[PDB]
Design a protein around this ligand. Sequence first.
Ligand SMILES: *[C@@H]1O[C@H](CO)[C@@H](O[C@@H]2O[C@H](CO)[C@@H](O[C@@H]3O[C@H](CO[C@@H]4O[C@H](CO)[C@@H](O)[C@H](O)[C@@H]4O)[C@@H](O)[C@H](O[C@H]4O[C@H](CO)[C@@H](O)[C@H](O)[C@@H]4O)[C@@H]3O)[C@H](O)[C@H]2NC(C)=O)[C@H](O)[C@H]1NC(C)=O
Ligand SMILES: *[C@@H]1O[C@H](CO)[C@@H](O[C@@H]2O[C@H](CO)[C@@H](O)[C@H](O)[C@H]2NC(C)=O)[C@H](O)[C@H]1NC(C)=O
Lengths: 122, 493, 99, 113, 75, 75
Amino acid sequence: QVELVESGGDVVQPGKSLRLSCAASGFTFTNYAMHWLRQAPGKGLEWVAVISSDVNDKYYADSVKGRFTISRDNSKNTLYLQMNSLTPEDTAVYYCAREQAVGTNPWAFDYWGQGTLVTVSS
Amino acid sequence: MRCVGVGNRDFVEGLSGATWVDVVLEHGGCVTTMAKNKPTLDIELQKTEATQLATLRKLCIEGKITNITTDSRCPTQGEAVLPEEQDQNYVCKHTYVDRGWGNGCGLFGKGSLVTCAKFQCLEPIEGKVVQYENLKYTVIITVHTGDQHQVGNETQGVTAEITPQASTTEAILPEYGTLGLECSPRTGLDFNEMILLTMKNKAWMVHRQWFFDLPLPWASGATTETPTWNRKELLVTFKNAHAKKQEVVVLGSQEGAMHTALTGATEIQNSGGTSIFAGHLKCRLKMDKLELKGMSYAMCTNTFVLKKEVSETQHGTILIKVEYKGEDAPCKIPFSTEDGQGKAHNGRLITANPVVTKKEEPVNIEAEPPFGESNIVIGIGDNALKINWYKKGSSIGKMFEATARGARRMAILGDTAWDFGSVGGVLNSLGKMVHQIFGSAYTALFSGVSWVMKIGIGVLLTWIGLNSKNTSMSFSCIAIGIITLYLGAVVQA
Amino acid sequence: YAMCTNTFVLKKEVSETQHGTILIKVEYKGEDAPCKIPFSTEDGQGKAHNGRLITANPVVTKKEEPVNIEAEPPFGESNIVIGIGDNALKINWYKKGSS
Amino acid sequence: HIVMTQSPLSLSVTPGQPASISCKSSQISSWGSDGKTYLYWYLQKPGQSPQLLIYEVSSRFSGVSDRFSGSGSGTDFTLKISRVQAEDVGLYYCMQGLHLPLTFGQGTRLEIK
Amino acid sequence: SVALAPHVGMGLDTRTQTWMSAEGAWRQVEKVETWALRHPGFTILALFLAHYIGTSLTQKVVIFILLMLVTPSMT
Amino acid sequence: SVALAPHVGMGLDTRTQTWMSAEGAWRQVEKVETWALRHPGFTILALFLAHYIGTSLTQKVVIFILLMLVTPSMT
Ligand SMILES: *[C@@H]1O[C@H](CO)[C@@H](O[C@@H]2O[C@H](CO)[C@@H](O[C@@H]3O[C@H](CO[C@@H]4O[C@H](CO)[C@@H](O)[C@H](O)[C@@H]4O)[C@@H](O)[C@H](O[C@H]4O[C@H](CO)[C@@H](O)[C@H](O)[C@@H]4O)[C@@H]3O)[C@H](O)[C@H]2NC(C)=O)[C@H](O)[C@H]1NC(C)=O
Ligand SMILES: *[C@@H]1O[C@H](CO)[C@@H](O[C@@H]2O[C@H](CO)[C@@H](O)[C@H](O)[C@H]2NC(C)=O)[C@H](O)[C@H]1NC(C)=O
């Protein structure tokens, strides 16, 4: 019954900014610790970033450190991923995932969004 | 004519010297009050909206357990300690365990281990109280005009919104004058002990004390990050695996359990604001500024022709739909019920005054005849339409149905049911007072007794009364047995 | 002072003290000098007068400022009437208990 | 960072036969405090967003056919598919979840022979 | 759990149906009936206890009914 | 199922601890206590019935206890 929808994927030249929005529905969004995920075509899934239930425990991966910003807005039920200094290697389809409802890990993936593709080239 | 096919219309005949007839507007019902000369009109409260309500407290129905951590001390040493015991978000239970040389401790005996765990809720359930400065009742007043599209229509009437602050009002009618309502909303359904609770786009009305009593972890209610849950041990269960070590388990989703815990609570729509249905309101109708607006008209000479076959309602009232034939005036519609060979008329016009309005639309009258063979004559001339009908029932059946309906009203509305059609008679006041006292006693005694237990206690008390030497039998048996069995039979609603 | 001659608008919903006294808070929307507030609590379904003010003289000093009359209603169900008596404000309230 | 290795990179099995995938970690995925191995397994159907199959290793996510079963402990885990249907084609991804920089394994695939 | 303590006898009732009127009317009696069907010997025990603790006949019947209704209800 | 007719008392028990002996041990007693404390009025009628049924004190007391344990749980 959970429904995750993406928005913001578009073509863009290198260096320019872009903000990705993950609208969620079917559950209380404010009591969860959302993730972001990506996969270049012909490659495996790659982790991107996590925002915890408390808004002040963000984390990012090594290859994307100091270049991306992840932020939640509880009231509007959307997940904002502000990405800067994008390069043609970073382009991929981006998946927005939910947390594990049943389990012990504070971080896991129950349900994956539909998925939006961002295209980066000159 | 809005109050025609509902099946719960209950007529209110007559009014006092000051013309303040009274009605009790039941949510599913409608009154269709009338008078000697005033325009007969039907009233029905519809929605009783409430808004700008605040969240009181939040309960949790689904939990997640993270960061299970454990420490254990040797026997004859203090209880095991974690630095995480004193965090607001941790549930942690001490317990015992056996350990000797196998666990690296020299002294044999029972040791103490503790397993703290971090608890964060996933889907809270909010309980939101409704205030009294925002409750808004909404009442439609549809007047019987015999209009073409008035029978059964649910979109005709004049809204008269009535809030507790501005209790009184005067609903101005299109052409029939003004009708004033002195309604009293504070004595109706009590909204102080009733707290709304909402989950997953479902809203219910529950008793306030019951909502506090139910065993789920609650919180402050004011929205904020990380609401520190209280009494959170109700979800987490700490199984001990036959004294060797401890495991921590979260109980699971309580949505289905609550959906059973709310068995007798009413339901309300929660799409926009709170459209609280399932209420009741009492009000008195001033009904002194109304005008018949048809008295000055004449009587139509030309004939009348019907358009639909006569069909009576569930309350034994003939409904006639007739279109006026060619003429050049609006008028009064003549009407007289006649038997086959008897000219005595006992059939009244529940419609106040049937008047043709625009000469092109059929005006549908609505009048009840006496039971038995009795035809109806409408037009004034000898070529008048003669609709013939044979009413099925009898007066005794009507009396029995009236007694059953009154019993239902007194069983549902309780104390305030004695003021339903009150003309202001002194006897009704005495009846209401004695019923109020006995009803307070009955509520105090039987509060919380279930549907089957009421029947059980009623039959037990009936038997006790029957087999009694003292002359308390004729009181106990009749009164308590009848009252309790009836309430048990019709309590659940 | 004279008698008030305009409608009163209730500003805050009526609440009851533990002892039974209603504490009304009316605001005066009318162009008139400071004057006495007419006050009569008709009882349930009757003209009888069984409720009395606990405030001796409920006068409005200024047009802008709202006054807050305290009065105890009849012990059952009643209808407090504040105003000129034709377009007066019928503040309704219901007391629960036994004498 | 945990190096994740999947033994097969392509499996061709005829319907009605078992197909097993081995994913070997680089360090221990067992969380010492609770004694639970935190591994995960995802199936990405052709042209679809991946779903979840095996949270932890013994356990199994809801809405999942009973055929799938996780096995293994201590850096070497294994799935099993008792009967393979046409819908089991996809890209099974073993991922660790113990340490915060979650690393998937290289994508294996399963095609009908 | 919370599945007990139904909002049954509060008394703030209206004309409309409650949450589960038809479904929740007979739940308790169905539970008692199925428990008695599952465990027959407790009927023998209740008969014995009522006979040896009930002086009159109505007392016997009442205490037997109370026992047979409480045991599945008690748990 | 609904949290009625639990698994207790069926048998098939052993020394290893069962599912929820920690919490469900006193659940019914706590329910009866909270229902009695939330609806104190029924005690008067229970005493009335107990006094009008029974020619002794033993059956009086047992009928009182049986009603006080039937009504809340059978609720
Ligand atoms: C509850 O249980 C969960 C279970 O995961 C715990 O989650 C921990 O979250 C923290 C994040 O706050 C994780 O910290 C990460 O540790 C990595 C360990 O790396 C090695 O360990 C040493 C010890 O410090 C490190 O110094 C070395 O780097 C070693 O390689 C670490 O690599 C990782 O760094 C990541 O984030 C930084 C900052 O963005 C990046 O610069 C870096 O490149 C990388 O992306 C984190 O620091 C920790 O690992 C998680 N636990 C486990 C078992 O993995 C919770 O802490 C528990 N408690 C609570 C209250 O939730
Ligand atoms: C209820 O009353 C409304 C309004 O009088 C009726 O709607 C009218 O229908 C006629 C014929 O279809 C139109 O010519 C009018 O323009 C409508 N008026 C409106 C929409 O305001 C309606 O038909 C009646 N009956 C029902 C069942 O709704």
